[PDB]
Swiss-Prot record:
Family, as annotated: Belongs to the engrailed homeobox family.
Function, in words: This protein specifies the body segmentation pattern. It is required for the development of the central nervous system. Transcriptional regulator that represses activated promoters. Wg signaling operates by inactivating the SGG repression of EN autoactivation.
Species: Drosophila melanogaster (Fruit fly)
Record's comment on post-translational modification: Phosphorylated. Phosphorylation may directly or allosterically modify its function.
Cellular compartments annotated: Nucleus
Protein name per its UniProtKB record: Segmentation polarity homeobox protein engrailed
Amino acid sequence: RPRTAFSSEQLARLKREFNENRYLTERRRQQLSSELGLNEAQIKIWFQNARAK
């Protein structure tokens, strides 16, 4: 799955979340998806990519 483009707001949330905990659980992935309007797949990819970088 190719990565979508994230808005500034979505990125703001993801960065703060990543800085609290770099690893996702199911419930946290679901909360992010529902609060960000992003597919869970996109959330997982962003976290993986962020750890990679």
